[PDB]
Amino acid sequence: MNKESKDDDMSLGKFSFSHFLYYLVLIVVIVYGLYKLFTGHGSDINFGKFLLRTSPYMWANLGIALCVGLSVVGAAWGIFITGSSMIGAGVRAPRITTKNLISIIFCEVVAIYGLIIAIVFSSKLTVATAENMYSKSNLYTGYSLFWAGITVGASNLICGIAVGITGATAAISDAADSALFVKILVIEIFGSILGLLGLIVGLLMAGKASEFQ
């Protein structure tokens, strides 16, 4: 449909400004453009008697790839937080340079979480998962797959950020060296099951790999 190029250009333009927001900005839209588009978008909903709503269609299958990229960004957001703590310690004392790799193992498993769901979300060479709203009806599966992939990618991205913050806080393990740092490692290890449980709930919520009818 016509929403394919609008969703692709909106995803590319949103990912470009979102990627350039955290880094050195070289191009960005003004703040008045959001209020100008919001005023013109909300002004057409009032008049006249026509109501605005969404259109039912899948329009893409790249939600598993965006979920795998969200999990890879979640692991990459925690690996820099762990390496910043390890390199922040550095040569201040003769300690382990791989003792904080326990959180980096869960952050590396956060990239596999959702990437395994991308291979599991094929459904027998899925160009179309089933009979959908492109030339037929009953397109709830293809439209519902993107929400499960983005939900599992957001859960893996949040679990990788939480495990990365728990590993980065477990890097020094204290604000005063008087006790062991295993107490921070227990709370950091207590959050590693959210990625496995969220990936199992996301994989179970997406259903099995049905045949492409």
Binding site: T98, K99, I119, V120, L125, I189, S192
Partner: protein, 320 residues
Amino acid sequence: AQYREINAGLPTIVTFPFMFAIMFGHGFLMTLAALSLVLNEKKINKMKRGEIFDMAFTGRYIILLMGVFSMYTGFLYNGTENALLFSNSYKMKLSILMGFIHMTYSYFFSLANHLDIIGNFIPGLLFMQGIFGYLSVCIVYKWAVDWVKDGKPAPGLLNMLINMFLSPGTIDDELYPHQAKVQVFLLLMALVCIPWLLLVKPLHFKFDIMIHQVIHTIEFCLNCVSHTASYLRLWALSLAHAQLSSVLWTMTIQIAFGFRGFVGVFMTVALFAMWFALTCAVLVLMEGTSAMLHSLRLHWVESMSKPYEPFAFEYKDMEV
């Protein structure tokens, strides 16, 4: 560490170099460059130069064995390179059994030792052995001579996702029809395996520690799914390195062999340097990217036994 009754693990010397070569005939150049360290071991023993050449020169035996297995592992993979769906079903089933065999072989020494380390080893090995045994046994049973049956199914972890969803398991496409009672008995043994594991922990201590015993109780079930989910890194780097090597290599041999004449010999001869340079750069990139086996073997290997001390002791074990 380097404790008495060395070395610091039997399965590290074979699982380390054998699992390191699984990420990669591109391995012939790595075995040829690795073979210089055999003759240059005596003269290259006292060099004292470089930060990566010293640590690479320290593991001469492990790099020689891993470079020796890289020729066989690289020459074996590089089934089919056209489609990306048939090779994944064999690499997934190969790395699943290869990871489960190293996991069971690594846990057999820790369960046999019995030296955190008190309990959780005698009552365990039931759920992971039933799930991984029913998956590897279903893949080995599906790898027989055939057949009139399904294709892409399971090929592994999807069948484990089908498990724990129904008592009478009949999920496809890879499954054993003789019979489906292993899923119900494995579900009953996995359901009854939960109280017997945590029940024997406080009994052995008596003639906080409760959160340590609960974290150590759930650490086996979390570590089993963590190891089984982390076992795809062997087949992922092989499948990415094979397409990444054949993709760049496929754009040079076609234009080189198309020319002819006196100018085509110099054009193909000058064009072959980019092909050999990219062919050695792909194996050097895979060998440089294969450094995760040291941390994975140092964490999973050192976790069941009891840092850099076991890796240094593994290189010092072959020297003395």
